[PDB]
Design a protein around this nucleic acid. Sequence first.
DNA 1: CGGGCATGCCCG
DNA 2: CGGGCATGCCCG
Lengths: 192, 192
Amino acid sequence: SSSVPSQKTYQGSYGFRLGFLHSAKVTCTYSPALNKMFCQLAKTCPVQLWVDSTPPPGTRVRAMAIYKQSQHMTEVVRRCPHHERCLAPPQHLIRVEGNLRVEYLDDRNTFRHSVVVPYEPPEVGSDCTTIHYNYMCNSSCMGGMNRRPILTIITLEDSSGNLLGRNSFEVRVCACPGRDRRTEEENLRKKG
Amino acid sequence: SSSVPSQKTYQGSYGFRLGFLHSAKVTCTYSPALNKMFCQLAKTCPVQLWVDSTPPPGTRVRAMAIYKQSQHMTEVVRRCPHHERCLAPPQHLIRVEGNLRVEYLDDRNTFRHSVVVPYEPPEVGSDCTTIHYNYMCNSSCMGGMNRRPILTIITLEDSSGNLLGRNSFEVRVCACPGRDRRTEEENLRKKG
DNA sequence: CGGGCATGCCCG
DNA sequence: CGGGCATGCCCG
Ligand SMILES: *C[C@@H]1C(=O)C2CCN1CC2
Ligand SMILES: *C[C@@H]1C(=O)C2CCN1CC2
Ligand SMILES: *C[C@@H]1C(=O)C2CCN1CC2
Ligand SMILES: *C[C@@H]1C(=O)C2CCN1CC2
Ligand SMILES: *C[C@H]1C(=O)C2CCN1CC2
Ligand SMILES: *C[C@H]1C(=O)C2CCN1CC2
Ligand SMILES: [Zn+2]
Ligand SMILES: [Zn+2]
């Protein structure tokens, strides 16, 4: 009955976790302390998928944004009117690049947007699979996120629709990821 | 042949001038030193029309915005996509309130927007006529003015289309007119 | 209300 | 590139 998707971590029977590359006032940088990606608009944000056990054939990887703060959690996250007017429907915040099987979904009941690609196991000798996401507005965009923090929820789903795993990370899309990560980490240490 | 309207002051044979009320970190405030109105979005910006000689019956008062800086002067000033989506067409920046004969014009050749009302002479004992303009975006709106200063051009035109007078003033539509007027006047004194 | 943060962007 | 302005908005 809820129109708010779960954000609860569920690493599940396949041992699903996300990973991030190591990254200066930079196009993206991930804070482990904050579980938060800082990235620039319309630029690559790589996300690694790690599993302990191989998901079945036909597994899918879905990404969806939700507002982090309770007061905004019921509002659908969408592209702002300016960037909408500038495969992906123009209203979608999150895109996937570099994939020939990307599907964009608008839920008929919840109106939430999501982007899905097939799960592919790592190549031999590799421990993870990387997806290249793109966020098409800044967190600050007027008429869109409007300075409200979001979480990205990554779910691993079988072809039948069973939830196999779920993880999430906060995102700030901003002009100066390195500056803003340093500011937020310092604020955590000083006032958190 | 130009699609850029003239901004040259022409006080003309009727002695046409504009005047502004005297106005604190306020909903509007006018700087004589800068010839610049500082006002808030979607709030009244009164403009006084002064003449030495009475214009003929059927005279009209037109207002049009143009970008002040040479680099932007050929671009039409429009409402940003966010405020457009929130009588006046939604794309028009400048509205007139309190008038039952307001006309909104989109020029078929230049694409410029303007808003026109009939000229009315002052009531007996008064020396000026006041029009209540409204600016429907901040100067800073992304996808609209985008922090570029504008001028408002006020023309007095007869019913036949003859230009009787023209005046202009700079406008900054902003959250804190009193703060910003003080900052700009101090910068003029210190660095201008 | 005024002080001061915010954050995309400017300038060196 | 990094320092620091910008400017709608937050908090007291
Ligand atoms: C987004 C950034 C980059 O461009 C590389 C890969 C992931 N992060 C860290 C370095
Ligand atoms: C999971 C692995 C790694 O740790 C490196 C970068 C991404 N994949 C391929 C090699
Ligand atoms: C816009 C402001 C106001 O609200 C009054 C009239 C004109 N200015 C100065 C005071
Ligand atoms: C021009 C006149 C004035 O100076 C005051 C305010 C506006 N009109 C009416 C009275
Ligand atoms: C964050 C800051 C930088 O370091 C350059 C890119 C974006 N912004 C302006 C210059
Ligand atoms: C300009 C500043 C003020 O003084 C109040 C109105 C708008 N802004 C926030 C509070
Ligand atoms: Zn946007
Ligand atoms: Zn606007």
